[PDB]
Amino acid sequence: GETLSEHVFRKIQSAIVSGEIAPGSKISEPELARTYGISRGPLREAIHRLEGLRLLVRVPHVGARVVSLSHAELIELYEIRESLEGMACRLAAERMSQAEIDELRRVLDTHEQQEGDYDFHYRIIQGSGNATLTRMLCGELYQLVRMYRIQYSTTPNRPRQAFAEHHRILDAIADRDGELAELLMRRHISASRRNIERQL
């Protein structure tokens, strides 16, 4: 079972990621507490966790604000993403069983929108054999990625460019070439960042 402080966290985290609460919105704490009817005891525990995930920001006199969704935060998020997703492909090419790679191939063929992208990257991170890697990618970093993409959709020709990048990454993992797969993942993540930048 979950605690009350955890139920409030994820329901707030979903409203921020999906866009129900706009970026930069001031969080009315006694007001939002009336929406769920729970004391401020465990409520600060929820807000403090969202500040650590850099979904909210602590303003010193005023209180908590939804993150700026700015250019500097985008560079911060894709720096770590490039390093973590890169080493995930390096370990996946080393550790993914054969049957794991064909399953990764099926998911690619069928999807031939942003959740099909999640499916491809999720297996690779899972195939890396590192649970701490999954917590930082799928648990923390992918939450801020999801709310940049909702506010800034992909450009018309991106899904075709990104799909070919996926095929080359999978082919390097199947060939057990971790050095090439890490390099291809970095280019693919860097291409995703430049897409969001062109719409800021």
Which amino acid is located at 159 in the chain? Answer: P
Residue 98 interacts with a second copy (CB under 8 A): yes or no: no
Site for a second copy in 24-63 (CB under 8 A): 41-42, 44-45, 48, 52, 54
Q: Rounded CA gap, 200 and 192, in Å?
A: 13
Going by the annotation, the residues of the binding site for Zn(2+) are 117, 121, 166, 188
Task: Pick the closer one to a second copy by CB: 69 or 162.
Answer: 69
Residue 85 interacts with Zn ion (CB under 5 A): yes or no: no
Q: Rounded CA gap, 195 and 193, in Å?
A: 5
Instruction: Pick what 85 binds: Zn ion, a second copy, none; C-beta below 5 to 8 Å, kind-dependent.
Output: none
Q: Rounded CA gap, 90 and 127, in Å?
A: 10
Instruction: Pick what 117 binds: Zn ion, a second copy, none; C-beta below 5 to 8 Å, kind-dependent.
Output: Zn ion
Which amino acid is located at 16 in the chain? Answer: I
Element (H, E) at 59: strand 56-59
Task: Pick the closer one to a second copy by CB: 21 or 91.
Answer: 91
Q: How far is CA 39 from CA 32, 36, 42, in A?
A: 11, 9, 7
Task: Pick the closer one to Zn ion by CB: 82 or 117.
Answer: 117
- Reduce the DSSP state of residue 63 to 3 states and report it: strand
Q: Rounded CA gap, 130 and 63, in Å?
A: 37
Please, what is the minimum distance in Å from the beta carbon of residue 54 to a second copy? 6
Site for a second copy in 113-132 (CB under 8 A): 130-132
Among 8, 117, 126, 137, binds Zn ion (CB under 5 A): 117
Which amino acid is located at 23 in the chain? Answer: P
Please, what is the minimum distance in Å from the beta carbon of residue 77 to Zn ion? 15
Q: Helices in 27-70 by DSSP H: which ranges?
A: 29-36, 40-52
Site for a second copy in 159-198 (CB under 8 A): none
Task: Pick the closer one to Zn ion by CB: 117 or 182.
Answer: 117
Q: Rounded CA gap, 112 and 43, in Å?
A: 44
Residues that bind a second copy (CB under 8 A): 1-6, 41-42, 44-45, 48, 52, 54, 76-77, 79-80, 82-84, 86-87, 91, 130-133, 135-136, 139, 141
